[PDB]
Amino acid sequence: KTTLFCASDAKAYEKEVHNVWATHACVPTDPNPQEMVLANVTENFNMWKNDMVEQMHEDIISLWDESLKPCVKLTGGSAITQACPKVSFDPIPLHYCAPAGFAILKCNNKTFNGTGPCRNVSTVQCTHGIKPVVSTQLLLNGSLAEEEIIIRSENLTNNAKTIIVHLNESVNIVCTRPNNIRQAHCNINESKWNNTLQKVGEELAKHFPSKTIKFEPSSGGDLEITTHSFNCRGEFFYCNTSDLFNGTYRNGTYNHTGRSSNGTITLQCKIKQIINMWQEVGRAIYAPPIEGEITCNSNITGLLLLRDDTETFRPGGGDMRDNWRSELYKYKVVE
């Protein structure tokens, strides 16, 4: 309804690029935020039409434009060239704050699915701290659902609408390029993953009750969405997930169908230089990988799925607004 500002806890002395951007763009955080419960009120939220998502999107586009400059950007006919130094890159949390005369309403119901009426509501200055993590298929380093796995969608009957799964337990994923120059791998403990897809299948079954629930790899698209792609210490990883989204939930029981070894799923990854941009239709070209060992140890805290007698879910992504949405779902700006 108005333009928000960000608060962050960044230092002017990190050269980490999120810190630099935030010290230019954000104000410091309140050491004690105010919060005002109101359990009588009941208000309506819709995470799928939330202008906070559009402001955060614009901010993160700006952050990446100033921080992860490509050697070459191809958009349409033009090709822009610029210095593309290797940088230190590690996302920091950002708070979105209502300016004077406005408030942010926060839905306090643990099981709120992001849409409709919410009975227990608070008013706050700023959202919690949100790390702006760009990725497909898996949502990394978010905040977990407080109680049970929530399944969010603008419309579950529309198979074209992205499904956001909000986990209540995180699943570790460790991706490393060890000391090919391009070749890397991710390790996931097949047991944790096993359990969580068992519970995700339960929830999806509540919403599609006659049907068998199948997880399969992504069908088609650019590599950015047919693999789990993400940025790690400035390098763009593309990790094959066909051993991950590969399993059947039949009779209240989940069977995993992808290959593991020693109780570990290992995704084969590549570090790429030519990127299909998430910000706009275009390609961006980066320099070859820095040397040493490139490792990110992340929490999987959610999934992005697409639905195709049986219901079949494949990993999705590509619109980073769904990533922001997964964190901003409980917030509205009012007044």
Ligand X SMILES: CNCc1ccc2c(c1)C[C@H](CNC(=N)N)[C@H]2NC(=O)C(=O)Nc1ccc(Cl)c(F)c1
Ligand Y SMILES: *[C@@H]1O[C@H](CO)[C@@H](O)[C@H](O)[C@H]1NC(C)=O
**Residues at the interface with ligand Y (CB under 6 A):** 91, 113, 115-116, 133, 140-141, 148-149, 151-153, 155-158, 168-169, 190-191, 194, 199, 202-203, 216-217, 223, 226-227, 230, 232, 240, 242-243, 246, 254-260, 263, 296-298
- Interface mask toward ligand X for 303-332; x: CB under 6 A: -------------x-xx-------------
CB closer to ligand Y out of 124 and 133: 133
Length of the chain: 335
3-state DSSP assignment of residue 76: coil
From the list ligand Y, ligand X, none, partner contacted by residue 227 (C-beta under 5 to 8 A by kind)? ligand Y
From the list ligand Y, ligand X, none, partner contacted by residue 203 (C-beta under 5 to 8 A by kind)? ligand Y
Q: Residue from 52, 130, 138, 275 that binds ligand X (CB under 6 A)?
A: 275
Euclidean distance between CA atoms 113 and 151, whole angstroms: 7
Which burial class, exposed, middle or buried, applies to 28 when counting CB atoms under 10 A from its CB (0-12, 13-18, 19+)?
A: exposed
3-state DSSP assignment of residue 55: helix
Euclidean distance between CA atoms 312 and 141, whole angstroms: 26
Kind of pairing between the strands at 283-285 and 163-177: unpaired
281 binds ligand X (CB under 6 A): yes
Can you say how many angstroms the Cα of residue 43 is from the centroid of all Cα atoms in its chain?
A: 26
Euclidean distance between CA atoms 22 and 11, whole angstroms: 8
Q: Which of residues 127-186 bind ligand X (CB under 6 A)?
A: 134-136
CA distances 83 to 10, 15, 87, 132, 276, Å, are 25, 17, 12, 24, 19
From the list ligand X, ligand Y, none, partner contacted by residue 47 (C-beta under 5 to 8 A by kind)? none
Residue 184 neighbours by CB under 8 Å, 6+ apart: 175, 176, 177, 178, 237, 239, 269, 270, 271, 294
CB closer to ligand Y out of 152 and 325: 152
Euclidean distance between CA atoms 89 and 99, whole angstroms: 29
CB closer to ligand Y out of 72 and 223: 223
Q: Which of residues 194-233 bind ligand X (CB under 6 A)?
A: 222, 224-225, 229-231
DSSP per-residue letters across 138-203: EEES----SSS-EEEES-TT-TTSPEEEEEEEEEEEEEEE----SEEEEEEEHHHHHHHHHHHHHH
From the list ligand X, ligand Y, none, partner contacted by residue 242 (C-beta under 5 to 8 A by kind)? ligand Y
From the list ligand X, ligand Y, none, partner contacted by residue 316 (C-beta under 5 to 8 A by kind)? ligand X
> Minimum distance from CB of 158 to ligand X (Å)?
13
Q: How many residues bind ligand X (CB under 6 A)?
A: 19
From the list ligand X, ligand Y, none, partner contacted by residue 32 (C-beta under 5 to 8 A by kind)? none
> Minimum distance from CB of 223 to ligand X (Å)?
9
> Minimum distance from CB of 252 to ligand Y (Å)?
12
Six token digits for residue 102:
């406005």
> Minimum distance from CB of 232 to ligand X (Å)?
9
Six token digits for residue 13:
């002395």
Q: Footprint of ligand X on this chain (CB under 6 A)?
A: 134-136, 222, 224-225, 229-231, 236, 275-278, 281-282, 316, 318-319
